Design a protein around this ligand. Sequence first.
Ligand SMILES: O=C(O)CNC(=O)C(=O)O
Ligand code: NI
Ligand SMILES: [Zn+2]
Length: 448
Amino acid sequence: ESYLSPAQSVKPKINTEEKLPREKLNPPTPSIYLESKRDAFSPVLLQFCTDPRNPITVIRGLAGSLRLNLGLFSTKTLVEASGEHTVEVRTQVQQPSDENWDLTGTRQIWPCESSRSHTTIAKYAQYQASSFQESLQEEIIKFGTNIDLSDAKRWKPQLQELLKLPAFMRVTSTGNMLSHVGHTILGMNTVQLYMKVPGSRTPGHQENNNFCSVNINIGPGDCEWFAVHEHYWETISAFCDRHGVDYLTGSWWPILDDLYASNIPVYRFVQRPGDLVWINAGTVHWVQATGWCNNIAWNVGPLTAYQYQLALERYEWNEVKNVKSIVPMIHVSWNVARTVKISDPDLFKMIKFCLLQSMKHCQVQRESLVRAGKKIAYQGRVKDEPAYYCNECDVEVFNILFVTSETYLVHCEGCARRRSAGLQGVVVLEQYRTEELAQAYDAFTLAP
Ligand SMILES: O=C(O)CNC(=O)C(=O)O
Ligand code: NI
Ligand SMILES: [Zn+2]
């Protein structure tokens, strides 16, 4: 049933069963300094970032290296650009980066209090200033997050500046899987902006479907990072379950000494302004703003055996957990095989095996349908067309689809069948004839 071949895994081997020393558990943060852009467009750094052995990466002083203008992202510039833009606010209590405490501050705990509000960039930029104001007068916090640069109109010069980036860091690249979904998934293939005051905290998580993440500190203020290799993710999960916080949907701040006691190595590093953090596929992380700063982040799937697997594992994992994979993987794999060539021998062979199963399933789902006497219509495809999801379970639907009215809905077989037992009142369609898929399959081969 699975779309992956375990025998094909490009994952590293960390069968490590020996308590690593203290120097191991506080391992040095992989880091790169960019003299010149020539460096930036080098393949060597691409190698580095994608290396499955490097869960996180900080390129140093990258911005000034490409001469990227971060004033475009300054809070002053954003207010002019859009003053009334909506931003969601997360209210929290200001604490030190490694600690999360109970209200009485007696003991330390995983679950992270977070409370949503909304406001305008306008007012919030005001708060960011009125906060820094009193800090001066001296010598509970609000956090702006999930602000869309998606609109290419008012954000135009903004988005036209991160085109200076190497191909693999860009929001849209023919070599970026998020680019083959064929529609917008916000803050992944769009740019999200964060405006912070000191102690602004993002709790533990992984990127959607294990996609790599690019993050650039606008500055001035520093951002403190913590991260853990994708390998340990399910044991961290185990902590959340224990503490009654949802791993995937929940807001949690890890207790480091818990992780250390788990023989779990932790990267911390500081991100200064102009520094680009690259989160590799799979890496559990959480962040805290030591300063006043703005940050910018979007998601990038590279094309690598590693990225693809982890994307697809999480995908199968979400079906199982009954969470929605924000990326329509089977749609993407097909959309890619067709558009893009492939050098990478493991990557190739992985998408191919996935496609085969994608193809094998339709052939079954159809076969059980046709002997069930169901009429299967063919509806072709429009250009610029979205992937499909069930209405109830939110699982991805590809190829054959189940439609209902009152204006139209799409279901998977199970959720459909439940509704109507004989698929009565349901119209089964095929977006792809069996030959269509058949040819596109062997049309897919290996590029030098
Ligand atoms: O930059 C921040 O505050 C949070 N960023 C992320 O979690 C990311 O880029 O993946
Ligand atoms: Ni993240
Ligand atoms: Zn369903």
